[PDB]
Design a protein around this nucleic acid. Structure first.
Ligand SMILES: [Zn+2]
Lengths: 86, 59, 50, 122
RNA sequence: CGACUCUUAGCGGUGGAUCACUCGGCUCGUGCGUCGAUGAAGAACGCAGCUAGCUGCGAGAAUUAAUGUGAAUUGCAGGACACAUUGAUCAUCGACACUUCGAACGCACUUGCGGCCCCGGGUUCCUCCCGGGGCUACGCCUGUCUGAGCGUCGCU
RNA sequence: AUCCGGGGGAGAGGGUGUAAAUCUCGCGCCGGGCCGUACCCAUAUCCGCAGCAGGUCUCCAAGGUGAACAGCCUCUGGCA
RNA sequence: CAGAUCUUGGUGGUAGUAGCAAAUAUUCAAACGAGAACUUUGAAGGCCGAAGUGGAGAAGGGUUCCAUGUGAACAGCAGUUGAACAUGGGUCAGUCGGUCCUGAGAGAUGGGCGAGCGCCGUUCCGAAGGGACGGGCGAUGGCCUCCGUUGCCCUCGGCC
RNA sequence: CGCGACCUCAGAUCAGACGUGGCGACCCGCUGAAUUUAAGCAUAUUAGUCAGCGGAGGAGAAGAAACUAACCAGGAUUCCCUCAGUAACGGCGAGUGAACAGGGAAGAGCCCAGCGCCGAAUCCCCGCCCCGCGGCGGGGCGCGGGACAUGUGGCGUACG
């Protein structure tokens, strides 16, 4: 039918892991992500889902580089001068 | 042996040959479920797999 | 499947490494709160991607 | 045991590699001791060695770049490493003595009508 | 009335309200007001003696070096240190590293296929097979080199 | 994709003991990275909120009666 | 605060009640064991009866696979068993597949459109071939004999 | 039917550069609805608002009148109070709705092209050597390259 008798035919996967967002949104039959949009050059961000800008903007990650700009700035971007040796 | 993930069978031969000053006939490398590339190093007939075993520490 | 891609086999490797229970000695740390692992899953009650 | 970084700064770059490969064999040996039994004596020691290789490698990488950064000083085209990395903007925006220039017209006016102190009784 | 039921009280259970706490939030103000092709934001994978996440970090991976302090970390074993000395632990971090995906950059998205130059095996010039090293994106500016035209001319 | 046969004759080869060629004729040497590889495959390991009478693609296919892979009984194999 | 078929949390009567009835079927003895209608062995009686209640695969699951052990919890009774729980172990390729090829289709530069992220389009308004035999010269290399090799040019090549 | 200028126009893994993306609380440029109100409803209102697209900065934008005035006249921009919920718009319904003048915060001014004069007096880059140099600058040395007459640099711009 269309109830439980039709749920057995579900043995295909339209989506799969994306390569940029990391989520499961990479629509296979047409090659375009859902959560970020992969082949395009612009991260998909919309203002109608404010709880979707909170999940993956700046802060939620590890910040391998934006963390040490903040440490660097407090002193003024010092360069090449080791502290006075002993 | 257990070998880094990105390592050819051509590369494992050189490492063991240069490490223990030994000879290798052929190598077989599966990759375990955990993600470590297990490697089976068939030893050359000129050498005794026990006598090399004692050197590298394993009983 | 026994035709799994390399990437999938790698992803199904982390999901095995982190299925273990907590080490016993964790509970005795001075500031310690956890008392049994929570993320732990059983392959009949969770479907890996959902 | 313990190897300071205050005796490694001067040894030859062909002498360090001798000790660097010595440890990597010593670390290789200990890793066996973990798998095939061993005791708590050797297991804790792996952390002592694994940081020694950090000490020796860093000293090499430092004397390799300090020498190079002496080689490229006084030159005008130096590789992308040895140039400062400040930000995106503090390289394209600022300038040494290029955005401190005054035209002839601007120079002569400041030269001719200089600003000078005064004060007024009430 | 022994039972059953009802009402109240003592006690014991199911339950977590009230009360007091609080390394948490909301709101207001001040100072500063800084990301990225030298590779950002985000994502995957890894790393501890025992360790799953949480945090921290990147094959130098629960950190290296330097400075300041000055005798610990600790859940258990181990030993580092003559604490005597660069000298345990922590804070700062200016030096030194920084895997793979990502604007993502040889073509692709399957650890797939390549080219061009250097080094070591493979050679001993004898071409290959192996490993290591450096490049191989689009648009755009100035300059260089090579060029195309029954475009405009000059000359022999 | 790849592999092959045919036509045509630009070229090569030596001047009398030897060549150039074998759409390798018989031998001989060296090399063949990278990733998947267990198991279930279903009235229990999949989808239906589960050890759900539902659903989901194929290969193998004995003896007897019988037109027959029908129905029914038995052997290899399996089950409570 | 008594109410809003009020929100969240909790507990009753119903109630030890409905129920544990789809596909013929179990019995005797023995073993470990504290314990046995259910676990294991043996004997018997039955069924699935090769379009299977059999022997393997693809999708899909992702360690359920195998061994040792456990008696909290789950397996709508139980259980000495498990698909559970705790430790260990396991997946080896020139020749089996992937990779290579094109199929319906998808898609970028050229071009066109568009306020704009981009869009239409696939030979279509494009200087789209970076390769080769030989030849002339310069020029190394190694027995600069001879050939491997290199730069300029002459030639050759449909861009489909 | 060769040689040499210039003009248009390509290819370079040519030397040296730069953009791509992220954040978006504040800002700038486009695009731009419907619930709602009118006791219905279409103009109107909600409103040039939310949603969409682009682009930066620690601030953006604006800015030294092709101005306001009509006075005995003020004097770039922005911001506060006031003018004012007024003038004006509106199925003149619902509703919408500024500005000049005043006092304050701050106060900063200017540069070109053209007209023309100066022997392109102008400029980018290579190479050499001397100095500094972790915002690549200065000293000179070059019968070293190129741009530039289809116009660079100084004087000079409505206050002349
Ligand atoms: Zn994505």
């Amino acid at each position: 039918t269309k109830g439980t008798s039709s749920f057995g035919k579900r043995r295909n996967k339209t989506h799969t892991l994306c390569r940029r967002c990391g989520s499961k949104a990479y629509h296979l039959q047409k090659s375009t992500c859902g959560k970020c949009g992969y082949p395009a050059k612009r991260k998909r961000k919309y203002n109608w889902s404010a709880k979707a800008k909170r999940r993956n903007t700046t802060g939620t990650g590890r910040m391998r580089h934006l963390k040490i700009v903040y440490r660097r700035f407090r002193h003024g971007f010092r360069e090449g001068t080791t502290p006075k040796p002993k | 042996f257990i070998v880094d993930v990105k390592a050819n069978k051509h590369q494992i031969k050189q490492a063991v040959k240069k490490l223990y000053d030994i000879d290798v006939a052929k190598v077989n490398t599966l990759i375990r479920p955990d993600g470590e590339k297990k490697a089976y190093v068939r030893l050359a007939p000129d050498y005794d797999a026990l006598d090399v075993a004692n050197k590298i520490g394993i009983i | 499947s026994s035709h799994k891609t390399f990437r999938i086999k790698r992803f199904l490797a982390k999901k095995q490494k982190q299925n273990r229970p907590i080490p016993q000695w964790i509970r005795m740390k001075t500031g310690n709160k956890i008392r049994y692992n929570s993320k732990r899953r059983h392959w009949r009650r969770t479907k890996l991607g959902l | 045991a313990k190897i300071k970084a205050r005796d490694l700064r001067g040894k030859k770059k062909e002498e360090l590699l001798k000790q660097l490969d010595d440890l990597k064999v010593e670390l290789s040996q200990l890793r066996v001791a973990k798998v095939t039994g061993g005791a708590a004596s050797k297991l804790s020691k792996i952390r002592v060695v694994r940081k020694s290789i950090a000490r020796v490698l860093t000293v090499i990488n430092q004397t390799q770049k300090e020498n190079l950064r002496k080689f490229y000083k006084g030159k005008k085209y130096k590789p992308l490493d040895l140039r400062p990395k400040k930000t995106r903007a503090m390289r394209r925006r600022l300038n040494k003595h290029e955005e401190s220039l005054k035209t002839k017209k601007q120079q002569r006016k400041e030269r001719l009508y200089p600003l000078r102190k005064y004060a007024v009784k009430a």
